[PDB]
From a paper:
Bacterial HSS is mostly found in α-proteobacteria and in some β- and γ-proteobacteria, including pathogenic strains such as Legionella pneumophila, Brucella spp. and various P. aeruginosa strains, including PA7 and PA14. It catalyzes the conversion of two molecules of putrescine (PUT; 1,4-diaminobutane) into one molecule of sym-homospermidine [HSP; bis(4-aminobutyl)amine] as the main reaction along with several side reactions. Bacterial HSS is NAD+-dependent, active at neutral to basic pH with an optimum at pH ∼8.8, and shows increased activity in the presence of 50 mM potassium ion. The cofactor NAD+ is bound as a prosthetic group in the binding pocket with its nicotinamide ring being part of the active site.
This study presents the crystal structure of P. aeruginosa HSS (PaHSS) in complex with its substrate putrescine. The PaHSS structure was solved in space group P3212 using the Phaser tool implemented in Phenix and allowing both enantiomorphic space groups as possible solutions. All six PaHSS molecules contain an NAD+ molecule in their binding pockets, and molecules A, C and E additionally contain a PUT molecule in the active site. We assume it to originate from the expression host and to be co-purified within the active site of PaHSS. The ‘inner’ and ‘outer’ amino groups of the PUT molecules form salt bridges with the carboxyl O atoms of Glu206 and Glu233, respectively, with distances of between 2.8 and 3.2 Å. Although PaHSS was shown to be a monomer in solution by SEC-MALS (the theoretical molecular weight of the monomer and the estimated molecular weight according to HPLC-MALS were 52 kDa; data not shown), these interface areas indicate the formation of three crystalline dimers by the six protein molecules within the asymmetric unit. The NAD+ molecules similarly insert their nicotinamide rings into the active site of the binding pockets, albeit with a slight offset. In addition, the ‘track-and-trace’ loop and particularly α-helix J of PaHSS are shifted in relation to BvHSS, providing more space for the pocket entrance compared with the BvHSS structure. However, the geometry in PaHSS is less favorable and the interaction energies are thus assumed to be weaker than in BvHSS. In conclusion, this inferior cation–π interaction geometry in PaHSS might be the reason for its reduced activity compared with BvHSS (see below).
Author numbering: 0 to 469
The structure:
């Protein structure tokens, strides 16, 4: 059930005008006439293309930094009914803006629950209160307090965001193939009942970035297909993962949250040091980094089934195989005591020679072993679909556009996550920007090629976390 056309708002406000924000303006141009809209962008960093932006939409740019002092003064004159606040910044508290948008009655959209300046790596803050799990529980507590009201969709980019919709569709594919049941769940509980009935035990966000760089890294240069400092920051945080009801042995140097709706583990080691085996359509078995991610918790909680005596819950976490440049950069990064790099470079469309960003979810434990579903977007395809976009950026920008259109057509939903949306509508908005949406089955498991652990008669034994992590 989808709206043929969604009317534009009266005003848009971009808190932060970085890569993703710029990668998103072209996509937004096709949908809505940016000249009939008053569009603000608040960023302390003036971009080079700010002139072309002003000579196409009349972009009212504000060179300022949003902090606890001046945020309630730069925005209040700008926020109101009919305004959409799109937060694509760093160091700005999403939760702080949510409450502010509720007062002004404005719609809110972001791709990450960011705290204020320095909320991730703050030694003065206790560790267990610096995890994505804790950031999410703050959002959920604010969701309960505010309750019904103007919509605010958080953490809806590519991942977290689209991948949540991929999980739902993957479950329906498995349901049609294994169970012959074409019945769509109607609520969270029914989604969890389906995951349990199929026997889903492990879900990976298995991403493989095969994009090749035009030129080679210069000395001391950290290169990546998206934000370098955003990648280093996520790589530095402790690895987190949803812990499933099938697991037995616990990871080493690990702690756990159990006061919520499901077990959530955070390992006291950087995600860039925790390597896990996974599977992607690029070349099958792959090695990724167990990077902490929002969807690792939201997906697991979404498919958690708690009854009087039993509990069902899959293991869910990110498995990221980044570009060849980032891997080599991470290597040198460790060699320099993880100090901030001398030089940085986010690869642009002109810098990428070939390759694709395989972004999808890998569901495991069911009758057919492994099933991968997601977006396979090549760089060449992205260049023909929009400007200022790589394969990595376009998948995110598409996620932003999807959430943008949902909050306009559903502006009275309060605070919501990707799981609260209608995945069918969410993907139909932007399916054309995701290149190839395919589902691939595979008889793979982390023990198939390791004689020391291979088993074909113990059902869930091959799906234990000990078999995935190195
Ligand atoms: N869900 C996803 O798939 C996904 C993918 C990538 C990024 N993101 C998120 O989107 C957000 C933006 O990421 P990006 O890749 O474009 O990073 P970026 O660094 O290219 O852009 C972030 C921008 O925010 C600006 N900024 C920093 N402090 C600010 C302040 N106090 N006030 C206003 N602006 C400020 C910076 O100048 C920068 O231009 C991040 O929070 C990131 O976590 C989500």
């Amino acid at each position: 059930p989808m709206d043929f056309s969604i009317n534009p708002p009266q005003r848009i406000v971009f808190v932060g005008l970085g890569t993703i924000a710029q990668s998103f303006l072209p996509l937004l141009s096709k949908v809505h006439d940016l000249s009939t809209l008053e569009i603000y962008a608040i960023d302390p960093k003036t971009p080079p293309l700010i002139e072309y932006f002003a000579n196409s939409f009349g972009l009212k740019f504000i060179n300022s930094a949003i902090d606890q002092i001046n945020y309630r003064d730069i925005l209040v004159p700008i926020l109101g009914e009919g305004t959409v606040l799109i937060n694509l910044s760093t160091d700005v508290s999403s939760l702080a803006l949510i409450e502010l948008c509720r007062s002004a009655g404005a719609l809110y959209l972001d791709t990450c629950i960011e705290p204020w300046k320095g909320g991730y790596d703050d030694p003065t803050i206790p560790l267990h209160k610096r995890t994505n799990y804790h950031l999410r529980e703050q959002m959920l507590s604010l969701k309960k307090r505010l309750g019904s009201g103007v919509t605010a969709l958080v953490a809806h980019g590519a991942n977290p965001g689209l991948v949540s919709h991929f999980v739902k569709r993957a479950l329906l594919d498995l349901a049609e193939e294994i169970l012959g049941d074409c019945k769509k769940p109607s609520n969270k509980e029914q989604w969890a009942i389906l995951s349990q009935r199929l026997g889903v035990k492990v879900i990976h966000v298995a991403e493989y970035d095969s994009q090749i760089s035009q030129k080679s890294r210069e000395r001391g240069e950290f290169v990546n297909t998206w934000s370098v400092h955003g990648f280093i920051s996520e790589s530095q945080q402790p690895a987190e993962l949803g812990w499933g009801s099938h697991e037995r042995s616990l990871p080493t140097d690990a702690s756990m949250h159990t006061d919520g709706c499901g077990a959530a583990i955070y390992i006291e080691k950087p995600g860039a040091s925790v390597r896990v085996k996974t599977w992607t359509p690029f070349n099958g078995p792959s090695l990724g980094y167990l990077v902490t991610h929002h969807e690792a918790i939201s997906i697991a909680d979404f498919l958690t089934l708690r009854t009087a005596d039993e509990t069902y819950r899959p293991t869910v976490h990110y498995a990221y195989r980044p570009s060849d440049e980032a891997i080599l950069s991470v290597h040198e990064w460790f060699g320099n005591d993880c100090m901030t790099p001398e030089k940085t470079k986010v690869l642009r469309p002109g810098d990428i020679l070939s390759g694709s960003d395989y972004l999808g979810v890998l569901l495991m434990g069911h009758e057919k072993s492994s099933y991968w579903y997601g977006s396979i977007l090549s760089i060449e395809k992205a260049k023909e679909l929009a400007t200022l976009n790589t394969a990595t950026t376009l998948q995110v920008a598409a996620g932003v556009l999807s959430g943008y259109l949902w909050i306009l057509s559903h502006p009275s939903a309060g605070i919501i996550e990707a799981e609260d949306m209608d995945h069918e509508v969410a993907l139909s908005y932007i399916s054309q920007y995701l290149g190839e949406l395919k589902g691939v089955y595979s008889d793979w498991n982390p023990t198939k090629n390791n004689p020391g652990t291979f088993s074909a008669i113990d059902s869930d034994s091959p799906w234990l976390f000990s078999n995935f992590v190195l």
